[PDB]
Symmetry: T
Subunit: 151 residues, 12 copies
């Protein structure tokens, strides 16, 4: 189960960075739609926190060792962060979230595949459920942005 | 529509088609305002289901037989449905809902008049209460569209 | 690529819409001993069906599909058949009719399960699996009230 | 001297005005509550587990109508009947001794007949109030008539019949 | 002369019914400073009385008895006396009236306790003990409002 | 629906002043009964606020323009205010609330009559329901003062 | 010792409640016939109540210095109730009659518990049996009424 | 000893009453994209204003003062200006109006803080501090919707 | 019922002192187990307060006069208090609670007997119920201390 | 009371005696108004317990040792207790509560001053919040008694 | 036919019933530091075990099977062995016993997952996957309390 | 208000790292006490998140720009992270949390000081409330460890 543990830990790092990025969007948001999207980022952060709980606990349960320092999150995550900026528009902010979500969904697909190969059905299900809700958020964010989900 | 039972059945049919149109709007919606109006359509659907509950039950109680098949609903309703289209703008979608609600308000006024003439006070109140809430929604939808209610 | 998953999801949209209509008819026209228990039960079943429609229509949209969204489309595309309401149908007959609709839906869900699996769409696969599980549990209970085994 | 004291039969009845019908409702609802409670206690037969607690729900609904109508009567300056003697003597519903050997169909039919009477009384109260222009009282009777009639449909459906209002 | 538990339970059915009626009268005809607090309290007392009625009638039926279930039986079997409602009674007179009814109920509950105890019917015994405890607590509060000791 | 709109706006004005008077009674109350009636005035204010919501919204819904400045409320209201005074007795305060309520009940009856004549059944029901509740309050307030409702 | 009998009847109850729970579960599972929708979940309510008595009686036994039976074999061997294989063909009315019989037994067992604990001066244990008996007897009345009969306690 | 603390609390009583009236106007007359979220939001703001009114009026009465309690007193003592309701105002101008009212209240609360701090009335001082914090947080949000920095 | 009133009042005093001891244990607790037992003392204080409500109210209802000053509580209670001391171990603090509870249970048995002798069944049940729960706690505390209840 | 810890402990003692006095009032009350004031005393006791929680915990947190025996509360409190008396009038009882509350508010002001002096801002806030609420109660109690707060 | 899916569901009915009994024993006989947190935790574990029994027995009935439903059947078909209750067992030994019971259940659920997957009974397969996931999470926690790795 | 803003941002960084450390402790915990302290870390994280919300929001409100990347949190925080280790004893873990909390409390005192000095009363209150709760946790954590708070 080496690869299942590896992708779960990858998720630990990526979810940590994704939560940070979402927090930035939440904080620096400006433009029409703020009142609805500002708290929505908070909802998205709670959902990301949720996946982190599920995945980190599964990794520990499997005898793994979750990344657990900002240095490890940053260095292992494939997501890049930039300085907060109030001048970013609402469309740009939402587009950035969509792109973070597409990355997460692809990671979850890899997680699904890897765990399926090793026969780790519990881990497999964790990734399937997370991927489903994230893809649903992509649909809604894309709809707000006037586009098809284009998964 | 010669009596109370008849207008009640007309309502069962129109409310059923109205529910379907609302669902279409809910599903095919795209554009800024999606996050607010997509779930709002679900509230409107719940409200419509509520009137269908009141009116169908009253019809049954009066010894009537409610239309209870999609064919009957579609054929007896005076509302017309068209294929779903993601390209309809958010504002055109809301304008469509307003048209549907104006029709229902007029239907309810007719039910009010008919039941009143026949002295069916219970049925009369049902239409009055439904008309009141529907008209209030017309005001809010029109306001979002930057217009007066124009009842 | 997911065209078949999309088609079966849309098939479910049509069938679930017709099933909801049939359940409403049973709810309304029901008469006989047991009415007080089963009339409100139909409302629970309608909420359940609505839930499946939400899950499947949203997944279809998410996959880039276009859900049927008019009564004519639901009626023409659904394999279920509707009949005019009739107060003389017995309680047993009404429950048997619901069982028939539920067996059809359970069969439809197995089909959705199979198609999604074949196209590698695991999210859609799970949606059908969860819906099949709950609807089959209802068949057991309905059949039980009817003094019969589930006979899946 | 002192004023002579009139000695006459009460008679009356006469559901002349809103206050009179509201008070008639106070009496009829009180006896109806008692009858429902009897059906509740003496019920036996298949279906007991569902209809026994249902009578309790019907009792609560009756209690509610009693609250609305008695309070409106007081608000109008009336004096509600408030003794079992006044309830029993003024109500047109007839009570009999409780009996455990009545089928469910028979119990439910009795409730339906009690409800048909109340719906009729409510229609009378609606007509009288409307004629007097007492719109508040008018709405009270209309609302109670509506729910009571819905109950008749359900009870009748259990009995395998149409509402037949 | 209440021979057994069934007899005192049925006596309570009648007495609780009349007490409820009296409480309702006080609720309706109340006038004076304190109305805003005591008018609704009467409703609480009625609900409590209802509770005892539920517990005692159900126990009687469970024991194979037949509860009084008509106003005629309640009125005639009850020892409580009703009078026509009158808005000219003071708040303090109304409360004293309630205390009287409660003292009567408490005495009846003691009888039920003694009778059930002699019989060895501990279930019925507890019902009377519980009802008695709460009724006496109310007498204390009512009397306190009236500037008096409980004087049980 | 000229008159209906006019009496609805009259109510907007009167309900706004009535709320102010209730608040005064709430704040300046002193004497035995304070603990019960002080919080009760807050309940009354909420009910008045509720009628204000129903009536102003219906007026907007009908194409009207609700009074929405303190100047308009004071000048259009038939209710008169006086400086707060802690020396008014509890019973005088309650009598004051009763007079305000008798006025509103009268206004609601007029609103009912006007709306009924113009055939505005939704407006008519709003006034009827508000009158029903205000009159119940009058009975209770009078009962506390040891009097009959005297509607 | 002084409370040897109370402890023994509490333990007898632990065994009988455990087997009664098993029987109720069987009725819940194998039920078929008109009335299933109302009685199937009702059995679940009864199981919850039975479970509640087991909590009360086992805890009091432990509190008194006893050792509760806590293995299926002890439950089965000490209980006076007999179990039979599940059977879908038992009628709804036969199933309810069976529950009535189990309850009549529990009610009598609780009466013994009451008598024994009362004789030993264990008032706490006495009240526990009294409250349980009261509810089970109310259930016998309702089950019997559904079956068209008097409680016949 | 607390003359100025009482004066500023009473100033708040008038200003909050007028601010409430202005918020109600914005609530009623609002038209434009965003109505569905900002219309209800105005009711939230009105409830918060009511809250401040409750706190400040009660503190004033508690300190032995006499709160303004007539529309005339509110109107004449408040420094906020009201104008006739107008449906033709844009959503964005309505929100800009709300921001102005809030900037004013936040300034008044700062005055309330300074004055009460000067007289050593710590309870009153905390009331103004807590109120100022929330109003300021609302200014940030409103400004953000309007694409601007809070600019306190 | 002189004896029943007397034992009830004795309970008022002992429960008042027991509440103080429990509060002391709550405040001065130090050692492994603090996090679970500190809030537990709060639950015990609440239960004790409840018994005080029941017993003091019953005494008043019987025409008695409850002790209602710290002096009366201290002088009538058979429980002895000592100065708070952080040096007491968790296990000793729990053993002290057990000691107080054994006393309370013994007291309640005496109240049960006295009331039973005088025929005061209401008071009798109040003591029986309090005794039942206090003894259940003794079992649990003792179990935590690796011992049998030893009632 | 030379420091924050000393004044916090003084409050522990005074709050303990205040609770006892409020309980006495709750138990011995007789007279019109009982039904509303008897339960109100329970609310006040709950509020008093709340201040005790906050102050005792803060003292412990600062390294102090709270008074934790009835002897300490009674001897350290500046409040005096007398035997319960059913003949005290309702008004007299409420006036007694007012005097206890005036003492507590005065003590809280001293705690506020001492802590502010020592720079202990956390403790300072605790006294400020408690003073705010007790003064509010004094206003309502005085109001029921037909008087101004007279702080 | 789903022969083996039905057999493993019934094996679980037996094993869950015995596991519930063992957990109840640990619950009752527990003594030692940690009792206050672990005694009620056992109740939580029993409720969860109970839930799995509900799910698995219902699925078996739904599939046309016949759940074991007598203590004798549970005891004779279960692979778990029970011993007499003993208060002298330490807290840490009790938790270790629970871990052993849970390791067995987790293995049982893995077996049910594989068998159901083999036969194409995806509904049953999901039930076992869910149950296995939670039981394994508990093993991690229990082991952690015991100062050890999960060692699944 | 430059220094208030600076200390608020320092807190954003320190709170972010503190959250990460708490999470590590939560995940890697092993030893008797796990079942109570594992969930407790979750409560602490939630509380830490709350301060982050209050402080980041106030910083934005004052015209500041909050650190919003893991790199900034890690580089600006004075707290140091180490690789997760399952062998560390429970008592060692709790001692580590105490050290993080002692640092946070000192940080909040500094924040209180700079804001008081600048006249920024709102920010001052935020640090005061947060310092209060953190110090309360230090007492409990120390108590579990058999020690005085030693603030
Ligand atoms: Ca958050
Ligand atoms: Ca929906
Ligand atoms: Ca529905
Ligand atoms: Ca038929
Ligand atoms: Ca009832
Ligand atoms: Ca017959
Ligand atoms: Ca009532
Ligand atoms: Ca208010
Ligand atoms: Ca269950
Ligand atoms: Ca059969
Ligand atoms: Ca509002
Ligand atoms: Ca406490
Ligand atoms: Ca209390
Ligand atoms: Ca096989
Ligand atoms: Ca349990
Ligand atoms: Ca968390
Ligand atoms: Cl039939
Ligand atoms: Cl059958
Ligand atoms: Cl360790």
């Amino acid at each position: 189960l080496a690869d299942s543990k590896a992708v779960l830990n990858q998720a630990v790092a990526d979810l940590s960075v994704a939560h940070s990025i979402l927090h930035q969007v939440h904080w620096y948001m400006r433009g029409r739609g703020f009142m609805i999207w500002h708290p929505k980022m908070d909802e998205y952060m709670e959902e990301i926190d949720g996946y982190l709980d599920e995945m980190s606990e599964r990794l520990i349960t499997l005898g793994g060792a979750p990344f657990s320092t900002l240095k490890e999150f940053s260095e292992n995550s494939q997501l890049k962060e930039v300085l907060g900026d109030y001048n970013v528009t609402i469309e740009e902010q939402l587009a950035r979230v969509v792109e973070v979500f597409r990355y997460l969904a692809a990671l979850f697909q890899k997680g699904f595949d890897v765990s399926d190969e090793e026969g780790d059905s519990v881990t497999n299900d964790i990734f399937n459920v997370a991927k489903a809700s994230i893809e649903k958020h992509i649909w809604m964010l894309q709809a707000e942005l006037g586009q098809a989900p284009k998964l």
